[PDB]
Amino acid sequence: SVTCPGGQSTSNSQCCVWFDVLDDLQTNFYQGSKCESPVRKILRIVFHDAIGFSPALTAAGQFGGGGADGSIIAHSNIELAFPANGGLTDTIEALRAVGINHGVSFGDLIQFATAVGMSNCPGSPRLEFLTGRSNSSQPSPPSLIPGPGNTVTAILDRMGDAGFSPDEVVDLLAAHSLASQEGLNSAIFRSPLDSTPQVFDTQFYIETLLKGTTQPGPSLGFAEELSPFPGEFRMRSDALLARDSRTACRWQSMTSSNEVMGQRYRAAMAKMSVLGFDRNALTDCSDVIPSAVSNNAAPVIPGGLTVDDIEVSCPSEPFPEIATASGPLPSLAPAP
Ligand code: HEM
Ligand SMILES: *[C@@H]1O[C@H](CO)[C@@H](O[C@@H]2O[C@H](CO)[C@@H](O)[C@H](O)[C@H]2NC(C)=O)[C@H](O)[C@H]1NC(C)=O
Ligand SMILES: *[C@H]1O[C@H](CO)[C@@H](O)[C@H](O)[C@@H]1O
Ligand SMILES: [Ca+2]
Ligand SMILES: [Ca+2]
């Protein structure tokens, strides 16, 4: 309906500012619309911004956090001291400058950059993008971000408080399809969590279910578990969630369908994106977000492993027919 200055057509004039943010992010933050470390850092940031939201604290007479309020940027001094917020400052500062330059709220910007960054990763769904979150925030309370050494009970309890069911926890973890670690084991920097850290696919769910056989680094880092092949890192929380009776069937159901995984992730991310906000008070600028290039690769069990190497953990459902590959085991290069 509306036409922005750049002859960009859109639903609402509140979207027009986001085209400039798109161009800037794609050129600079994303270094030419790539799916590399900046997107992965932004996914940590979107989660860690949003999850600073705790109805249980509010019920206990305390500030529980404002959710997707950009507090991780506005109050980065406080929040980047939290255990789970390491390795983010450089990204946060990039975001800070974009937000100030274009005059958009920090919480909107994080959500936007997430949608934009996902759009650079093959196979991603089109994440919703809503604009209008206040730029005002208070610091997140501490201790609201699930950590990789937490038990499943702890993770589900925390995520549940924030508002997510166990299924949605699993669904949100599709982001570990585009993932590495840098801070858990310094010896294998950017060791990916799945064999395709630049493709938004089901490989993460498949590979976390493989028998842990491999120590990818010379020693173990924090919350590290054996992985199924060289170069791949496995964090304890993912290992446990793949196998826990409360999450294992959803986890297994992710494995064979990129398209169901993407829908579920999109939905969960939409929910996370408005923790602390009324989505009905925001403006839908989802049309600013382009579609990602499609991923034509099929789910696979890598490296000559078979379903026998999958620790099938959903006791009521057969493991999906997933193609195998030739051996030998791969060695994952560091995520770019
Ligand atoms: C459910 C609990 C979760 C836990 C315990 C967890 C834990 C972690 C840890 C410890 C890392 C490694 C960070 C580093 O050392 O560099 C990681 C990476 C990552 N996480 Fe999660 N995470 C969880 C959920 C999520 C969610 C919901 C998202 C976003 C929707 C997310 C997105 C990412 C991404 C994209 C990376 C890769 C970062 C990189 O490659 O630099 N995680 N996560
Ligand atoms: C969002 O609020 C933050 C403050 O929490 C504003 O950030 C400050 O912006 C001033 C003016 O540009 C900079 O000098 C400070 O460095 C910024 N502080 C921090 C902590 O980032 C930001 O300008 C506000 N954004 C909008 C659109 O109003
Ligand atoms: C196998 O090879 C990859 C590099 O090609 C490494 O990243 C991995 O740690 C293992 O050496
Ligand atoms: Ca926040
Ligand atoms: Ca992947």
Describe this structure in words.
- There is one protein chain.
- The chain is mostly helical and 336 residues long.
- The protein folds into 2 domains: 12-145 and 269-296, Peroxidase, domain 1; 146-268 and 297-336, Peroxidase, domain 2.
- The N and C termini lie far apart (39 Å).
- It is built from 13 helices and 10 strands.
- The strands form 5 sheets. Strands 1-2 form a two-stranded antiparallel sheet.
- The chain is globular.
- A molecule of 2 linked components (NAG-NAG) binds at residues 74, 96, 99-100, 103-106, 135.
- InterPro entries: Ccp1-like, Haem_peroxidase, Haem_peroxidase_sf, Ligninase, Ligninase_C, Peroxidases_AS, Peroxidases_heam-ligand_BS.
- Its cofactor is Ca(2+); heme b.
- Pfam families: peroxidase, Peroxidase_ext.
- This is Peroxidase.
